[PDB]
Amino acid sequence: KNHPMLMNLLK
Amino acid sequence: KLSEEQQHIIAILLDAHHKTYDPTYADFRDFRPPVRMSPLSMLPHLADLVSYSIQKVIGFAKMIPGFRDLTSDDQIVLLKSSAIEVIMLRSNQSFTMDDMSWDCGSQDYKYDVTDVSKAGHTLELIEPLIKFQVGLKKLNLHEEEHVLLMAICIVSPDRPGVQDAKLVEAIQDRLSNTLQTYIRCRHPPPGSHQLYAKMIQKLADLRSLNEEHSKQYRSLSFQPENSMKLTPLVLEVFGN
Ligand SMILES: C=C1[C@H](O)CC(=C/C=C2\CCC[C@]3(C)[C@@H]([C@H](C)CC#C[C@H](O)C[C@]45C[C@H]6C[C@H](C[C@H](C6)C4)C5)CC[C@@H]23)C[C@H]1O
Incomplete structure (x- = not known):
């Protein structure tokens, strides 16, 4: 499903 | 008795919590x-x-x-x-x-x-x-x-x-050992009594809470009228 927002918050 | 590394772990976590938890709740004014x-x-x-x-x-x-x-x-x-x-x-x-x-x-x-x-x-x-x-x-x-x-x-x-899982466990074990040592070295009695065990039990209690509240999230969000009131991040992280 991909988690673009979560991924960005982890950067 | 807290090793240098254990004190470092704690120092890092305290700094991390302080920068992510504002005790004044000032940002709440930005919510609907x-x-x-x-x-x-x-x-x-x-x-x-x-x-x-x-x-x-x-x-x-x-x-x-x-x-x-x-x-x-x-x-x-x-x-x-x-x-x-x-x-x-x-x-x-x-x-x-x-x-x-x-x-x-x-x-x-x-x-x-x-x-x-x-x-x-x-x-x-x-x-x-x-x-x-x-x-x-x-x-x-x-x-x-x-x-x-x-x-x-x-x-x-x-x-x-x-x-x-082994890598995740490696990190958790370092954190767990840090917590156990901290309690024995810095938490005075009687508050320290079986404290580690009680704390880990809370984590077990949370699995049940997670299960029940997640079921509620799924039921609530299943209705379009309700999902419409959520946020993009909630839908992404909790499911959509
Ligand atoms: C900065 C902070 C302050 O201490 C204030 C906080 C308070 C926490 C509260 C008080 C209000 C009710 C809270 C959200 C509890 C909620 C309802 C338990 C749950 C659940 C469902 O799986 C998710 C979900 C279901 C629906 C739609 C979304 C928002 C809300 C209602 C929670 C997602 C858990 C923690 C509680 C949160 C904390 O992060």
Whole structure:
């Protein structure tokens, strides 16, 4: 499903 | 008796929590306003509070020593599964047994059972959460113990979907040993009595809370009218 927002918050 | 590395872990976690948890709750003014009188009048506000909290939990997690060194997929699995549990844990800081509510600085940002009921929850589902908060508050945790507990919750090697369980376990073990040593070295009796065991039991209690509250999330969000009131991050992290 991909988690673009979560991924960005982890950067 | 805390090793140099253990003191470092604690120092890092305290700094991480302080930068992701504002005890003044100033940002709450940016949320859609709470409405106390679609009968789910508090859904917009609590959805925003939870979405905001998810962002902060992720911010805390990324600072846990070693977490960012796990694969991105495992980081995602760990956060999706622990998010609601960590929000419950961190919320204990605002929770008060005075009147069984989460007091965030003002009447407008003071949430009780009725408020949660106005976000879709049945009173039956709310009760166990209140009981959990009371039990946790009574442990009178040092902030050091509080941040270690949240970190341990996040890096749990048994979450379904985790690929490198051994790596996740390696981090959790370092955190667990740090917590056990901290309690024995810095927590005076009688508050220290079986404290590690009691704390880990709270993590077990959270699995049950996660299961029941996640079922509620799925039921609530299944209705388009309700999902429309949520946020993009809530839908992504909790499901959509
Ligand atoms: C900055 C902080 C302050 O201490 C204030 C906080 C308080 C926490 C509270 C008080 C209000 C009710 C809270 C959200 C509890 C909620 C209702 C338990 C749950 C659940 C479902 O799976 C998710 C979900 C269902 C619906 C729609 C979305 C927002 C809200 C209502 C929660 C997602 C858990 C922690 C509680 C959160 C903390 O992060």
